[PDB]
Paper text:
The xylan-specific α-glucuronidases from glycoside hydrolase family 115 (GH115) specifically catalyse the removal of α-d-glucuronic acid (GlcA) or methylated GlcA (MeGlcA). In this study, we report crystal structures of a bacterial GH115 ortholog (wtsAgu115A) identified in a metagenome from an anaerobic digester fed with wastewater treatment sludge. Furthermore, wtsAgu115A eluted from a gel-filtration column at a volume consistent with a dimer in solution, which suggests that wtsAgu115A is a dimer in its active form similar to other GH115 xylan-specific α-glucuronidases.
Three Ca2+ ions were modelled in wtsAgu115A D303A in the unbound form. However, two of these are found on the surface of the enzyme and are likely to originate from the crystallization conditions, which contained 0.2 M CaCl2. A structural comparison between unbound wtsAgu115A D303A and wtsAgu115A–xylohexaose yields an overall r.m.s.d. of 0.17 Å for Cα atoms, which suggests that the binding of xylohexaose does not impose any major domain conformational changes in wtsAgu115A.
Author numbering:
A (entry chain A), B (entry chain A): 0 to 300, 319 to 838
The structure:
Amino acid sequence: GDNKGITYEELNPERFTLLEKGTPTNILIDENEDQGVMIAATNLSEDFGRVSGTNAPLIFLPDNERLIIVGTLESRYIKELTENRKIKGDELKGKNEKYLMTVVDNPLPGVKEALIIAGSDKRGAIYGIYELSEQIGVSPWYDWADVPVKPQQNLSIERGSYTADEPAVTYRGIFLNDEAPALTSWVENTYGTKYGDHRFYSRVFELILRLRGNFLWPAMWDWSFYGDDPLNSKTADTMGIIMGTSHHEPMARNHQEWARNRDKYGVWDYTSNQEVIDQFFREGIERVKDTDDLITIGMRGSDEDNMRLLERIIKNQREIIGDVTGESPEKTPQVWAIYKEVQRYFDLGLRPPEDVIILLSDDNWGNVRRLPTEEERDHPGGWGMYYHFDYVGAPRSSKWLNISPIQNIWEQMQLTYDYGVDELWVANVGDLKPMEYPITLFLDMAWDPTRFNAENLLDHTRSFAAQQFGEDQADEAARIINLYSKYNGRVTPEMLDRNTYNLESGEWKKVSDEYIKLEAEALRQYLTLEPEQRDAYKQLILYPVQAMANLYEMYYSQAMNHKLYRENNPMANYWADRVEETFNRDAELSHDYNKVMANGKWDGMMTQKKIGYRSWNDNFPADTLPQIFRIENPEEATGGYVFTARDGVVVIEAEHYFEAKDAEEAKWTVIPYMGRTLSSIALMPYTKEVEGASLSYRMQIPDEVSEVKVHVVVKSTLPFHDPKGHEYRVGFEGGSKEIVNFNWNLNEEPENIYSVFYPTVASRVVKKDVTLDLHDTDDGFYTLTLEPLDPGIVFQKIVVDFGGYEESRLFMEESPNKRIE
Amino acid sequence: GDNKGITYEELNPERFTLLEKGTPTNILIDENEDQGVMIAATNLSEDFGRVSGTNAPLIFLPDNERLIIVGTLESRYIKELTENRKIKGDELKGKNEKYLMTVVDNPLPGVKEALIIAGSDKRGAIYGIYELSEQIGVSPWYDWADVPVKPQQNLSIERGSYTADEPAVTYRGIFLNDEAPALTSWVENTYGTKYGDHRFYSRVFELILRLRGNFLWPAMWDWSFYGDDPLNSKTADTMGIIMGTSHHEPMARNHQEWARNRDKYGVWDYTSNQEVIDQFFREGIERVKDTDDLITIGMRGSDEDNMRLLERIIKNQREIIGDVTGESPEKTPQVWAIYKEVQRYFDLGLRPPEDVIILLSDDNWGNVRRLPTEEERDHPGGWGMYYHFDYVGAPRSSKWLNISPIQNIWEQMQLTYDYGVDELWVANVGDLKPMEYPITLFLDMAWDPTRFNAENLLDHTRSFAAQQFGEDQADEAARIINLYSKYNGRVTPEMLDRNTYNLESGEWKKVSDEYIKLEAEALRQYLTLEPEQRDAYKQLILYPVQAMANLYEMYYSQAMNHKLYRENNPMANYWADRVEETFNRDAELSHDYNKVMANGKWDGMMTQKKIGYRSWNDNFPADTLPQIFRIENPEEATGGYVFTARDGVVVIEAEHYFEAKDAEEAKWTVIPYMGRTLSSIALMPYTKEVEGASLSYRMQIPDEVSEVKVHVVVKSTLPFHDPKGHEYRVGFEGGSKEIVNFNWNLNEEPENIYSVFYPTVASRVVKKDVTLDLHDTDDGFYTLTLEPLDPGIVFQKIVVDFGGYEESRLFMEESPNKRIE
Ligand SMILES: [Ca+2]
Ligand SMILES: [Ca+2]
Ligand SMILES: [Ca+2]
Ligand SMILES: [Ca+2]
Ligand SMILES: [Ca+2]
Ligand SMILES: [Ca+2]
């Protein structure tokens, strides 16, 4: 985490041994230490168990000659080292959330050598403990993304003095929100509770602390953090998480505490229900009195009368705080949120009391609305920013996957920090998963925005990947995380549909093929992993990539189906099938995530519907098959194709004729897939005469064109029946025709054998061209005919060329066309 | 194989039980049966072992009341059933290679019920036995492609009478050729022999017989089938394989028998060394006297004197055959090959004796050169066709993978059969692997070409896939086999290079992305397989697909590297890296095939070099890295980009400026990957004034253009500093400029909030356009400048539009450009 390259997998005299032949060195702690530090030290002890197979013993007396000595500045053992100048206590005293990690010789009598982890306060000590956890190899995501722990037999750590200094943002954390159906289902499946209890939140707290955050807004759609379980707040307070509430939840009451008793409580109008709402406020403050939770103040129900009533609500709330806490209101931390109604009041002069944090919000889509000017930056209480990775509302909700590329988060948050907003940073994380990477980035940036610039963003992603998957996997894993996040930034999954990208220009095909290419790369990486890494890889990379590449292909296929159905081309049916198959594959992938991956550990987390949005909300029953169209009796829907020119050319796959007239006995037969592109078409069988047979093609050409060059691509058939060679006649109906002999020189005569013969047969095709004058027509429509004059001619592709011809192995993209009857 | 849907996985009173609760029914055979039939029956007995865990007992007396009774028409038990009209003996007597498979009640006294497998001759009986093998689920490829056998506890087979009738081609088989280094290395690794001995060939024979072929040309570059091991011919003769030799190996002597003693033997000129060469011929015929091998006749060293000497050689060879065999020469089967020199002699009238098969050849690339006319079809000896899946020679060798799509094989071989060529079909198969599928198709077609037409080719591929991988895998496995074979038909791997496909038109990207998409589909299928199917899938599908998709991407990357290096664009370095990585991946894939897959069983088979061809032959040391180019000091090779218009537009990724002038303090900073396409560029940090800063772009426009529409795409930044909004100035240097305010209406005012505000911020970008008159310039070069007037403007993309603009999510493909200094 903080300090890279200081822990080694083998021992050394000038390094400090953390683990030797499977035996961990013991951890010394003051048995009366802050309990949250003790919990973290117990987690560290188990972290040594995950590494080596045996927990590091947690002792209360220096029984041993080598020790890991942990604690706060005021615990008995740490206090003794600072007093004896064995540790630079000045670097910690008065500092916020800071640790000092260093090896010292003879720290205590009877102890020869120790690693010291001293915190300026309880969170500083917890953070230093979790730094050691990451050194020995336990990712913050070891539980919440199943990131396995590499087993070890020996670990040593370099001497030196290490710290993360102080955090740059005072309160750094997350907001569980948009939490139904995913997080709520997962909690009910895991804990049996239709609410979040202290078991669930304890698990959330440990993750936030390991990530070095300190702050949480709890889930509140249909839950109440404070009311549902009395141990919720007690656990948060003990463990070291600062709790808060969102914008319109004043005075440490969760919204649902009012809603669940809306009939008993009244109006929520401060003018009529004033003493009912005052008592509401008071009870809340009483619940939190000796915790350090952040208190939202204010309220949302003429302009000057509104500004006055809000002024009264606030100073009323602050006398209630004074009353309950028994000390002046500024001794309790407070936050006041700017929303639309009160944004006007602010610009007219309205400010909270100056010790109060003023919380700003982004636009629900990751862009900051408003930042302090140089005159407003003065505000002694400072400023907050609320940022979205997930949103329910306009113009359409995004509830499914990560949509927040790393560049976007950084670009707006670096602006936020440079304008002086550094008291509170809190991110809407949805159900938490699958926002694991943007959460890590956002908290790391809140710790020290200074270490992030444009040139080094991806270094962060790389270190993240090396932590989750090992050095040897990190470059490629980070590349894929960065690139899929970028793709998801182009358009949310919920707003992606058949019309998002340009079909005719090739843009749709490009972005669909490129997402599938990303999937192929993720699959190759997946196959190189050890089995114990697969679930973490699926959660962090493979499922978002596979689900998005499948979703892109579904809508790309739908647009392809609609285009071909309009054109009356039976190929629409193939694309209808692909829409069905990909749509079902979406259900297969999320079934795997919920039920099979990690033995169903995350069942519930991936139940959000995403296919079938018609408005902004997800109030449709389930994932729904995108509408598709089918051509009845397709194998009889042939011929009748008419082409329009495009870019100085008409390019024609040979089976898309207008009409075909057969021979006596021999019939035009298309050979599916044959040749370089669509197919081949030939008179079958090769034993009958071809007299009178023909293929004809209908095409529109701009009347400005007076002569064309016709290219005809056929299979490199050799002259098996007659060494004169095969000929066919080619020309426009009512105009000039020429006869082409395409293989007279495909033989082993000395002048042919290597100059032409072996070159064209190894290529498998023959291209010939004639130049034909274009006679005048009233409508611009022409009929090109192909009359074979020998048996066995396999026609494949035609291009009539009047400027736009491009040399190419496939003979160019087919021009626009339609089918008739 | 022959009869589908007649074997069931559970028992039934009206079906015949082959396997019951793990116990197989016994196989009755005449203990004095033809030994090759006995070997096949022993293989059938072991096939029941692979299915159920216990071999079917092979007995010589009807000890049991239910039996599988097998044998030739003249074996004692079969002979008794035909005599008692229990079997329709008339349907078999006189017939060639035909079996009858049918359930009969009370076949023999003491036997209540039996499945009878009666052959018209030894191969007919062997074929009927192997039909039952496929019914119970043992693929012909169970050994040669590790196709696993589904375990069973119960099998029953429907009553009825089943046959494959008689084969349509008399001799059907393969030619091991181009066999070094792959097949030779695999044989040395597996058998320790620098030659093919009877252990190796016995394994080849069993495969050919299970595939229902009967013919082999043995490996002969540096081996001698007849001379290297005396059991080679004896095993072929016993087992039932007809042996032959290639065109210029007359009289059952392999070429190397002459070459290894070229100093002792002389000239190989029938005029000078006549009695030395006569004795050569005689010894050969003596070796084969009572086998049924096919004898090549003729010889290759004025025109009328040549036709006379060849006439003399032939009738000389035929008196030698008469002498050795003691019977007239026509009682020994003979074949005479047409090659170039003697093609003239044929058209002047020269024919072999009329009992001799006249062997024709394709062009070494799968196209038939010459077929009999209606007058020549008369030839009583009939005709052969030699067909290539592999070739060493012009214009360049193809030695690595399958290059023969199913459509091409069928289209030429159906022609071959319809013109009366049906005595000998033999395919050059290289090292045999990896031609497994075209071999199966080619032999199946030789058996009965009648059942193949254009509409049903892929049904064959589907049945093949269902046999190797199960019903549930068959559609998808066949789809991939068909599509990769088609791709390999476009250009051989050896002739593919950076120049094969069109780069500028998008064709190269298309075919590279589509091969990778095929790989992604193969990988998804691979993950659904049972572990015991993985090696067969890798051999038949995953390795050819992965190796080709990697090879395509390597050369596509090389062409991309060369284009960007020419343009002096540092992005060439990324593509240089991809060439290196893909080139090494080619070595990783074949290492896996040789050393890891199937525990190294096939080590040697995939050692052919394929990257580095400069001429027709593979006489370079090893796979060699394609040449790539790198730009030194790349992160300082920025700016200086000049664009040329294309298709009525100039499309510009914002970081490709010509020059950038910074502000006081704030500097132009590109944010890699940010936005929808290449990147974003912005003045950093957002706290300093932007006065005087600019980005300028140089572009050439046709002088016919008099006004343009300029689109500028920026990030949807909101007016955080000033609700007036952000502005930038945009215009041409020396011409008109306009000022754009791009976010004045991005707010929650009632007229903005849902009409524009939430729509554009959810899209993350803002596009604005101005219309600017185009002033005259002598050279057609223009400079467009972008001057930001507020902090925090994130520029992303520009398009100057004069006709060619297309609405698109990515704002079109960047126009041609170069970098300067
Ligand atoms: Ca969600
Ligand atoms: Ca501050
Ligand atoms: Ca679903
Ligand atoms: Ca080979
Ligand atoms: Ca015949
Ligand atoms: Ca190699």
